């Protein structure tokens, strides 16, 4: 297991434009296209991103292409965020994958606000952080996914994805 497989499990893979859990235009392996209610807008974004007229449909290779850009960018944003970097740096490999997963799903900003849990993580107080993480909109909305991520932080293993 690794971050790529982890995320592929959590986000799925769809070749036609679709609405995510929040109702936003998405494609591929959880590649957000736009937050606008317009399918025209998202198509336009899709075309810009792929570099061709897609008509709202990409190939599997194109989806992995976006995925390959998206994963590293997530990491890069964490390393640039003053709130996140120190947590990420204190963590072990498996647990960093859990943080990236969150950042990938909700963005830096989304995550930068889990202050209290981040602090707990940094302190390596696993069970407590796990508890605190669950007290969130995130958990109430995507409980199954949140649970997998939470187990990962709590245990430091890939047990939840296996
Ligand atoms: Cl892009
Ligand atoms: Cl879920």
- The domain locations on the chain are 1-162
SS3 state at 57:
strand
Resolution (A): 1.9
Tokens describing residue 59? 């190939």
Please list the active-site residues.
11, 20
Kindly tell me the sign of the dihedral angle through the C-alpha atoms of 32, 63, 92, 137: positive
Cα angle, residue 70 at apex, residues 83 and 140 outer, rounded to 5°: 60
Cα angle for residues 27, 32, 37 (degrees, 5° grid): 95
Residue 10 CA to ligand 2 center (angstroms) comes to 8
Q: Which residues surround ligand 2, an ion (CB under 5 A)?
A: 142, 144-145
Compute, in angstroms, the gap from residue 144 CA to the centroid of ligand 2: 4
Residues contributing to the annotated binding site for substrate: 32, 104, 117, 132
By what technique were these coordinates determined?
X-ray
Q: How far is CA 87 from the centre of its chain?
A: 17
Residues in the chain: 162
Exposed/middle/buried for 62, CB within 10 Å: 0-12, 13-18, 19+?
buried
- What is 1-162's CATH number, 1.20.1090.10, 3.40.50.460, 1.10.530.40, 3.40.50.20? 1.10.530.40
């Amino acid at each position: 297991m690794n971050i790529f497989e982890m995320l592929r499990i959590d986000e799925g893979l769809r070749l036609k434009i679709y609405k995510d859990t929040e109702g936003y235009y998405t494609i591929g392996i959880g590649h957000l296209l736009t937050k606008s209610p317009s399918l025209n807008a998202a198509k336009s974004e899709l075309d810009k991103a792929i570099g061709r007229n897609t008509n709202g449909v990409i190939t599997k290779d194109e989806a992995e292409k976006l995925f390959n850009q998206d994963v590293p960018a997530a990491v890069r944003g964490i390393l640039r965020n003053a709130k996140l970097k120190p947590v990420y740096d204190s963590l072990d490999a498996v647990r960093r994958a859990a943080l990236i997963n969150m950042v990938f799903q909700m963005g830096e900003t989304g995550v930068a606000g889990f202050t209290n849990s981040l602090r707990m993580l940094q302190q390596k107080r696993w069970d407590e952080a796990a508890v605190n993480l669950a007290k969130s909109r995130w958990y109430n909305q995507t409980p199954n996914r949140a649970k997998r991520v939470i187990t990962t932080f709590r245990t430091g293993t890939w047990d939840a994805y296996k």
